[PDB]
Amino acid sequence: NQLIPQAYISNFHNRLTNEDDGIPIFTMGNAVLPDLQDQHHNPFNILRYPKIRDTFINGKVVSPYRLSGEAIMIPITLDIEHM
Amino acid sequence: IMIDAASSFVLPISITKNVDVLQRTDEILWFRGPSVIVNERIINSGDPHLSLPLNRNEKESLPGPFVLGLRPSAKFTAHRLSMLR
Amino acid sequence: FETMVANPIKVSRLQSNGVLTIHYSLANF
């Protein structure tokens, strides 16, 4: 018990449509992330950050998807409006 | 013979104005039975006035109950205080 | 004064033996 599992959190599209991060895909201490400060090895201390508690609250449950001599690099552009 | 009786009662009228020496709840606890007073928790099973040997009406008022309490001398306490620091 | 019966305080032995003192363990969102 008292272990956080490895998966079943994919809160990504809400951060794509969060309207504050520098993402050009969609249109319509003092550190932010504790990757340099310790939490005394307690899970609850991660809930004080607003960019992480939003991921814990607004997450969702997905299913895991299961799937030449010289390379020719061709850049492919994409511009499609939808809804 | 029952075990899980209450044996604790508190009157609803709070007269907690001059009551600070009794046993409070933190109100006054009122039991179903009184208290008992024990003088000394240790009994010297020697001191032959209590053991009554069979060798030899005599009245004798001993000074204090501390004969029957295994009280040590002050010299060992002073020696332990000298061993403290 | 003689009509002033009090409220009994129960033992609560299951709450007297081993009661402790859950969102604090992060396993339920």
Swiss-Prot record, chain A:
Signal peptide start and end residues: none
Subcellular locations according to the entry: Nucleus
Domain of life according to the entry: Eukaryota
Post-translational modifications: Phosphorylated in the G1 phase.
Protein function: Component of the chromatin structure-remodeling complex (RSC), which is involved in transcription regulation and nucleosome positioning. RSC is responsible for the transfer of a histone octamer from a nucleosome core particle to naked DNA. The reaction requires ATP and involves an activated RSC-nucleosome intermediate. Remodeling reaction also involves DNA translocation, DNA twist and conformational change.
Family in the record: Belongs to the SNF5 family.
Assembly mode: Interacts directly with STH1. Component of the two forms of the RSC complex composed of at least either RSC1 or RSC2, and ARP7, ARP9, LDB7, NPL6, RSC3, RSC30, RSC4, RSC58, RSC6, RSC8, RSC9, SFH1, STH1, HTL1 and probably RTT102. The complexes interact with histone and histone variant components of centromeric chromatin.
Other comment: Present with 3940 molecules/cell in log phase SD medium.
Name this protein carries in UniProt: Chromatin structure-remodeling complex subunit SFH1
Swiss-Prot record, chain B:
Disruption phenotype: Heterochromatin spreading downstream of the silent mating-type locus HMR.
Signal sequence coordinates: none
Top-level taxon in the UniProt lineage: Eukaryota
Annotated compartments: Nucleus
Role this protein plays: Component of the chromatin structure remodeling complex (RSC), which is involved in transcription regulation and nucleosome positioning. RSC is responsible for the transfer of a histone octamer from a nucleosome core particle to naked DNA. The reaction requires ATP and involves an activated RSC-nucleosome intermediate. Remodeling reaction also involves DNA translocation, DNA twist and conformational change.
Subunit structure comment from the entry: Component of the two forms of the RSC complex composed of at least either RSC1 or RSC2, and ARP7, ARP9, LDB7, NPL6, RSC3, RSC30, RSC4, RSC58, RSC6, RSC8, RSC9, SFH1, STH1, HTL1 and probably RTT102. The complexes interact with histone and histone variant components of centromeric chromatin.
Family recorded in the similarity comment: Belongs to the RSC1 family.
Note: Present with 2330 molecules/cell in log phase SD medium.
Protein name in UniProt: Chromatin structure-remodeling complex subunit RSC2
Organism of derivation: Saccharomyces cerevisiae (strain ATCC 204508 / S288c)
Swiss-Prot record, chain C:
Residue(s) carrying Phosphoserine: 16
Oligomer and partners: Component of the two forms of the RSC complex composed of at least either RSC1 or RSC2, and ARP7, ARP9, LDB7, NPL6, RSC3, RSC30, RSC4, RSC58, RSC6, RSC8, RSC9, SFH1, STH1, HTL1 and probably RTT102. The complexes interact with histone and histone variant components of centromeric chromatin.
Domain of life: Eukaryota
Miscellaneous comment text of the record: Present with 2610 molecules/cell in log phase SD medium.
Residue window of the full protein shown: 29 to 65 of 581
Protein name per the record: Chromatin structure-remodeling complex subunit RSC9
Stated family: Belongs to the RSC9 family.
Role description: Component of the chromatin structure-remodeling complex (RSC), which is involved in transcription regulation and nucleosome positioning. RSC is responsible for the transfer of a histone octamer from a nucleosome core particle to naked DNA. The reaction requires ATP and involves an activated RSC-nucleosome intermediate. Remodeling reaction also involves DNA translocation, DNA twist and conformational change.
Subcellular location(s) per record: Nucleus
